[PDB]
UniProtKB/Swiss-Prot annotation, chains A, B, C, D, E, F:
Range covered out of full length: 2 to 133 of 329
Protein name: Minor capsid protein A1
Note: This protein is translated as a fusion protein by episodic readthrough of the termination codon at the end of the capsid protein.
Native source species: Escherichia virus Qbeta (Bacteriophage Q-beta)
Known function: Minor capsid protein.
Location relative to the cell: Virion
């Protein structure tokens, strides 16, 4: 769709946070859309990127992929410009066949959304302990 | 957490569907837990897999990855039994720092859950048209 | 112009058919806008694509090209996912001079549309017999 | 069909122009039909060429291709015999499957004729601005 | 933002002119978008080009540049086809630091926008006499 | 014209700011006039520079160029005197032919002035979004 200003609500550990994301355009060389967290500094802000690809010479399957990049900063030692100390990464990859149905696509989409909130993935992500 | 029988609700194109995935145990060689929707034939059934890796000697980053595999079948292309005709793939990969905070991790978790429901990603996944 | 939903009417062998083509966005890498007849499966759908390129360092000629791709399917023996058996292709290529006049361009444009309806081109395309 | 004298009406940017094209024979070496703008001079005249080909050693499909070439002249540069300053080019190529149906063929034919009159292709050809 | 058709009003020496500029696409090699006022002959028409940067490995500091190229031609010399004799050129280059805030950025913009209308720059651009 | 004290109004992101730039003389070696916004510390202050050409024997094409340099500083790191951390750069270059007309020159001038306020440049400069 249009690269609008998206606002994700009910986010965070508590679920009472929000995150505002203004559009950042596409990259006409990479063919990848990007948008960034509504923050002052481009270096400090989190970003997410979405891309869809037509089939080609490698494989003739459709593939869409989103990336997330959330850095964090410190102020006490540089006391002037906060610098990034560590980052947090996220990357998905969807791949459907040329004969994939519309419903097949949405099912895998909400399955991931619901799978991101299941008790199993809570300790898999936040406490980082596997299924046992 | 514990490998119980997870049931995802509010799933599908409509958003009023459900998918049940009973546990199938862990694979202590691959280090991947796996669980699948209970189906007759092993090839036909839906499946998802979760895995976490501690920082080894090669790379000192934490990495957790979940995969989704939804096949589709037909009862009339092979005029006796059902054959798998097409596939649908999904897999995410998160990677946080050794000094990463607990809340940072959950933020990337709910951000992806909400990002999978934003109007923009609907057309990226369901209609497969980039942001324009 | 703007990437609108284009609808060609009074189309077909009889000339009393219609074809609806919704926009599907642009591809900033290929430099091609594309739009397709709205269908469930991407492989089944009809498609048309328009592209213009300005004269660069390679060649100092203007060139605009539209492609047409109409597949056909079968609902039998598979009766689950219809498969595309054969296709029908169309591709034009216009190239005018950098100093070409506005009127020159439209004349070649309406000439092609009118030439597509001349008695001669009907039997060249529909009856597949050369001029003899 | 027969190589008759075709006359395209309702032509040009204005839309109330006409163009008369007498038959010009075929090219018995290239196997391509040709016909030319009704006028005194062979160099000055606009021309179009139509060709249909049976399947052979390269590919076992069918291909029909028409070209349009409209040059333009000036009298003052040589004040005696007008010389061509620039040209205007048009080239289509249709290719249907060996198993193609009659109705499919005309459908791709009228689609291009109607596509040549849709607002979108007007600004792509006359103002040379892509779909946006 | 998105490449729409922008129309500048209150323009020119008089201040009672207007200029309409349709989009002309991107250059995936140069990474620069371009758009031009719709004119009869492509050579005579005005055009302007916009380009920004994105986070890569070479330089993380941003640079944005817009170019203006307004040519003019003469017709009465050969009564064949008017030729472009001279142009008028303009290019800006903004470059902000990686840690630059949005509010800082707009200030440099409106400073330049207002500076283009200040009495001092009036005589530097229109009358071509220096500040002394 | 003469280097007076220029004051730009209706400036900034909001459009409700103003910027005063007092003259700071000419550069008799570089042949470039310069003037700057009167600020406390000379490094922190904004500045702009204007330069043209004059009739000499080397090349007979005129060139006028304006540059903008708006830096920004941070004070809290050395707890003594703020240092400049980042700048914002802008430079245009106009170049008209020896036979250029007065009216042609203003056209390129107001086109650039209006083009910096067009929706296309809105995301190109402030949001650093390409035309796509």
């Amino acid at each position: 769709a249009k690269l609008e200003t998206v606002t994700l609500g009910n986010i965070g550990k508590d679920g009472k946070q929000t995150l505002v994301l203004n559009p950042r355009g596409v990259n006409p060389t990479n063919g990848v859309a990007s948008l960034s967290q509504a923050g002052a500094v481009p270096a400090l802000e989190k970003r997410v990127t979405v891309s869809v690809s037509q089939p080609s010479r490698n494989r003739k399957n459709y593939k869409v992929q989103v990336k997330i990049q959330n850095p964090t900063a410190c102020t006490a030692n540089g006391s002037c410009d906060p610098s990034v100390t560590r980052q947090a990464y996220a990357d998905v990859t969807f791949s459907f066949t040329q004969y994939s149905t519309d419903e097949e696509r949405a099912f895998v989409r909400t399955e991931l959304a619901a799978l991101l909130a299941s008790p199993l993935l809570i300790d898999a992500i936040d406490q980082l302990n596997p299924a046992y």
